Design a protein around this motif. Structure first.
Motif, PDB file in Angstrom:
ATOM      1  N   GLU A 129      -4.825  -2.881  10.841  1.00  0.00           N
ATOM      2  CA  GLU A 129      -6.482  -2.187  10.218  1.00  0.00           C
ATOM      3  C   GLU A 129      -6.888  -1.043   9.500  1.00  0.00           C
ATOM      4  O   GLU A 129      -7.056  -1.217   8.357  1.00  0.00           O
ATOM      5  N   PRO A 176       1.289  -5.750  12.784  1.00  0.00           N
ATOM      6  CA  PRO A 176       0.899  -6.086  11.770  1.00  0.00           C
ATOM      7  C   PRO A 176       2.016  -6.804  10.534  1.00  0.00           C
ATOM      8  O   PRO A 176       2.386  -6.683  11.664  1.00  0.00           O
ATOM      9  N   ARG A 177       1.547  -8.654   9.902  1.00  0.00           N
ATOM     10  CA  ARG A 177       2.632  -8.681   9.598  1.00  0.00           C
ATOM     11  C   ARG A 177       2.085  -9.727   7.539  1.00  0.00           C
ATOM     12  O   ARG A 177       0.669  -8.079   7.300  1.00  0.00           O
ATOM     13  N   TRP A 216       0.587 -10.297  17.931  1.00  0.00           N
ATOM     14  CA  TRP A 216      -0.742 -10.583  17.176  1.00  0.00           C
ATOM     15  C   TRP A 216      -1.025  -9.430  16.870  1.00  0.00           C
ATOM     16  O   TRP A 216      -2.031  -9.121  15.297  1.00  0.00           O
ATOM     17  N   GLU A 235       0.098 -11.561   5.514  1.00  0.00           N
ATOM     18  CA  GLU A 235      -0.358 -12.232   4.219  1.00  0.00           C
ATOM     19  C   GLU A 235      -0.472 -12.719   3.560  1.00  0.00           C
ATOM     20  O   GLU A 235      -0.146 -14.256   3.892  1.00  0.00           O
ATOM     21  N   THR A 238      -2.706  -8.025   4.374  1.00  0.00           N
ATOM     22  CA  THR A 238      -2.079  -7.042   5.411  1.00  0.00           C
ATOM     23  C   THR A 238      -3.274  -7.342   6.497  1.00  0.00           C
ATOM     24  O   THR A 238      -4.036  -6.612   6.233  1.00  0.00           O
ATOM     25  N   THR A 239      -2.452  -7.708   7.770  1.00  0.00           N
ATOM     26  CA  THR A 239      -3.089  -7.543   8.916  1.00  0.00           C
ATOM     27  C   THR A 239      -2.956  -6.798   9.901  1.00  0.00           C
ATOM     28  O   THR A 239      -4.676  -6.388  11.205  1.00  0.00           O
TER      29      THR A 239
END
Lengths: 44, 30, 98, 181, 141
Positions: free
Chosen positions: D163, D31-32, D28, D34, D160-161
């Motif tokens: 940062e 990065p994925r 988790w 969204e 994107t997840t």
RNA sequence: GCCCGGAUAGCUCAGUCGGUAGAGCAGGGGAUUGAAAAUCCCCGUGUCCUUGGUUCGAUUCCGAGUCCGGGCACCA
RNA sequence: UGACUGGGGCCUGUAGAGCACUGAUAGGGCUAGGGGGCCCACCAGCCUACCAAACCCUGUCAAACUCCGAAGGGUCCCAGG
RNA sequence: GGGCGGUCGCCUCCUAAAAGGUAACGGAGGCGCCCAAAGGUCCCCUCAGGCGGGACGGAAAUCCGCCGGAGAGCGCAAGGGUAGAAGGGGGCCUGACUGCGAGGCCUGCAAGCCGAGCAGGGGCGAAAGCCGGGCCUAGUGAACCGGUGGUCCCGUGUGGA
RNA sequence: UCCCCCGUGCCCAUAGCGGCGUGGAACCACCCGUUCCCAUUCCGAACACGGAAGUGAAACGCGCCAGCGCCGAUGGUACUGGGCGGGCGACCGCCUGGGAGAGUAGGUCGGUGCGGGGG
């Protein structure tokens, strides 16, 4: 505009205010009478 | 539905879309 | 946030609070002003099945039998973010009606 | 339609290469994607009787999902319309539908862009997630040449997840995002 | 002259003068200062005549600090009119000054010239003055 | 409030005593002459306000709604 | 049961003070624009003891500003009277 | 002093001296309407701004991401109040009820205001419940004389007029 | 009685923002799906339903920290019920009961009821 409301098929009045241009013509609305309890009422 | 894209550069890509018959002049191969 | 707190719209006593967790479903009858629970019941945390909506009714009927025993008759229904649906405690017994 | 190239060839290639490239602790923490959200906008709720959900279904072809109309708030008395009642036109793509669009976009669209050379490098420029826009609607595959009343454009935004925009700059170039660095 | 460039209202009431200064009572900007003994309203044209005099005296000099502002408007009725008919027109601007307010300051000039220039100012002003130095004006903690 | 007239071409207006939709002006193409006009040929243009009904069909004939226009009164 | 007084409990935005809100404000820092020198019109570039937003530091002002706020006053209860 | 000028009812803030009240040809603004959804109820949703990022796109047309307890919004003046909604969006509706009304605010009079609760017949909700117009405070006019529509009443010897 | 977690009240920031550690057996959440009930001005994002392959990353719980935020004496003044002065007046002083606000020393990363599950 000044306005009076009759118990379709008899006496009665209630009396309100319509706005002619703004949503008006053929005002009809459900209401209670002391005469024969509720009854659908129209303009005049 | 599933679909095939048919390049003018020979190649065939196989994805999905709507309407499966697709003539394209050039994909990512030029 | 989910502010919600329609529970704030409680006037005239005795609150039946409900908690829906991803696994479970719990409920406590509260007398506020005092600040005190009187009666309770829970999901498998009460020792019970591995289903969902069937389980709900069961905990419901459970709460019923226990309350009437204490002399408690009528109340008012909760769940904060209710959306009154699915997991319902549509139980006989308690006089909160519906 | 449950598994496409970008789908598969993300978990079975791009996924591990980033846990290496950056050394993460969690599935988790990587990065994925969204979400991908396109917007047309235009501004054509004018005279000559303006239909133009006509051009919202030709947008529904390329994407497969049907778009919602978006309305107005202030009033540009300087260049017409006010109040509400307007034109802006929008659709939110999440998963599967997400990759299917991106799929053909990377294989067939950006290639079809008249000259082209690569996407602009720093349209992240910081705030994670990326943005691009388009002039033409016919660089798309499923939309035809003879069904055009009038070409028009759009504003594609990809979330994107991740940062920082390093973590992201990687993830997209690896799935095949052509960059004019 | 020296007036506010915007105001919520154009005319205001008169009001009394209680003692003290409330604030403004310690030097805090230059080397030598001028403090007030009598309460009064000080007009802008006085403040100015005081300013120009200061500079006049020591030409090409230091820095002057005018630590007060004519924020309050002055009403007066046209000549030879009777009473009522509502408030006058605004004819100028003044600053409320009470006992202990430090009105002026200079810095970076010979004690000789400071003492002098400040004394000339008091001759422009409708009140009694006193001169001061830089003593226990240390409101730090 | 009560009693009369009316809506038809862009403008201003004539109609079968039920079966036809017509004028003038303006606008437009041409003839014209020292210039500007006045001649003279030529064409454009309709839900006849309006919804109902009589009727073999209706612009006309009648119920009704609507707005513009007159005429005569009342006001505690 | 009165005026007045003792003991309690509520209510209040003045005197005074303050700058958190509304506005006003002197000087310095930091810094959009604009003026102007270096200069090229292919549009950039560097400087300026110019005028200057927003923001921060120091110092203050206000019936129709208040983060704050007395003495008192209003009222109800128990007493003396 | 009188004239010329200005004003005459109503609402909001200050003058008002920390209950209420309180003057001047004292300082400064608004009303003489509007809403057939701008009303009832049930279920949802949260602002303005600022800095990023994006084809046509200004300096806020619409899109995306962070920050931002209220400075936005509430038909129109100002004040108070308000997101633990009074604000924004939908579904069903017409309580913008009839018959009353314990008890109080305000007050020279007459007026103005707030109102729990019972009966009747309804609307929305699973229920608890809420609804006797509108976030609130301006949008107003005693009696007299007449008009229209009803109804138990009176009807100049009696019936009717 | 003593710990931990889940619900739910009272206190009304000494409970807050931001930093830094931890916690998954059990709770809790995210997670797997979209046939079914029920959903979207377009989106199973949200509501909702059936699940348990995975994770404590996000969210939440628990600590520790004072940078911002919040609380804040003691003294001494300002002002003042009542009594009395000085001056010719703007204004100033005494006596007796009451007493701020700023600012200083300092305090704070909470306290506390009822009910459940786990040792």
């Amino acid at each position: 505009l000044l306005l009076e409301c009759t118990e379709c098929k008899r006496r009665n009045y209630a009396t309100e205010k319509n706005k002619r241009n703004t949503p008006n013509k053929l005002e009809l609305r459900k209401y209670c009478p002391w005469c024969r309890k509720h009854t659908v009422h129209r303009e005049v | 539905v599933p679909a095939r894209i048919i390049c003018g550069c020979g190649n065939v890509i196989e994805t999905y879309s709507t309407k499966p018959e697709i003539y394209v002049e050039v994909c990512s191969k030029c | 946030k989910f502010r919600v707190r329609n529970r704030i719209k409680r006037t005239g006593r005795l609150r039946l609070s409900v908690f829906r967790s991803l696994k479970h479903i719990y409920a406590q009858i509260i007398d506020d002003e005092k600040g005190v629970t009187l009666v309770s019941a829970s999901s498998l945390a009460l020792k019970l099945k591995g289903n969902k909506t069937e389980v709900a009714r069961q905990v419901g009927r459970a709460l019923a039998e226990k309350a009437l025993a204490l002399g408690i008759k009528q109340v008012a229904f909760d769940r904060g973010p209710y959306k009154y649906h699915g997991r319902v405690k549509a139980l006989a017994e308690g006089a909160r009606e519906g | 339609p449950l598994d496409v190239a970008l789908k598969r060839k993300y978990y079975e290639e791009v996924r591990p290469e980033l846990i290496r490239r950056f050394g993460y602790q969690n599935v988790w923490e990587v990065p994925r994607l969204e979400k991908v959200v396109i917007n047309q906008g235009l501004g054509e709720a004018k005279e000559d009787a303006r239909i133009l959900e006509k051009a919202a279904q030709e947008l529904a072809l390329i994407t497969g999902q049907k778009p919602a109309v978006t309305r107005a708030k202030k009033s540009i008395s300087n260049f017409k319309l006010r109040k509400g009642m307007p034109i802006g036109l929008r659709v939110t793509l999440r998963r599967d539908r997400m990759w299917i669009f991106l799929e053909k976009l990377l294989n067939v669209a950006l290639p079809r862009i008249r000259d082209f050379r690569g996407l602009n490098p720093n349209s992240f420029d910081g705030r994670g997630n990326y943005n691009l826009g388009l002039r033409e609607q016919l660089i798309f595959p499923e939309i035809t040449y003879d069904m055009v009343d009038a070409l028009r454009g759009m504003d594609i935004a990809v979330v994107t997840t991740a940062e920082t925009d390093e973590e992201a700059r990687a993830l997209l170039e690896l799935l095949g995002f052509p960059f004019r660095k | 002259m020296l007036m506010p460039r915007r105001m919520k209202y154009r005319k205001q009431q008169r009001g009394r003068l209680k003692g003290a200064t409330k604030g403004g009572d310690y030097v805090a900007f230059g080397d030598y200062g001028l403090v007030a003994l009598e309460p009064a309203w000080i007009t802008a044209q006085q403040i100015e005549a005081a300013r120009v005099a200061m500079v006049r005296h020591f030409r090409r000099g230091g820095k002057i600090f005018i630590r007060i502002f004519p924020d309050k408007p002055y009403t007066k009725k046209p000549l030879e009119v009777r009473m009522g008919k509502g408030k006058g027109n605004v004819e100028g601007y003044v600053a409320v000054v009470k006992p202990g307010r430090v009105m002026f300051e200079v810095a970076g000039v010979t004690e000789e010239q400071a003492m002098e220039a400040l004394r000339i100012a008091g001759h422009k002003l409708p009140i009694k003055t006193k001169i001061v130095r830089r003593d226990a004006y240390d409101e730090a903690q």
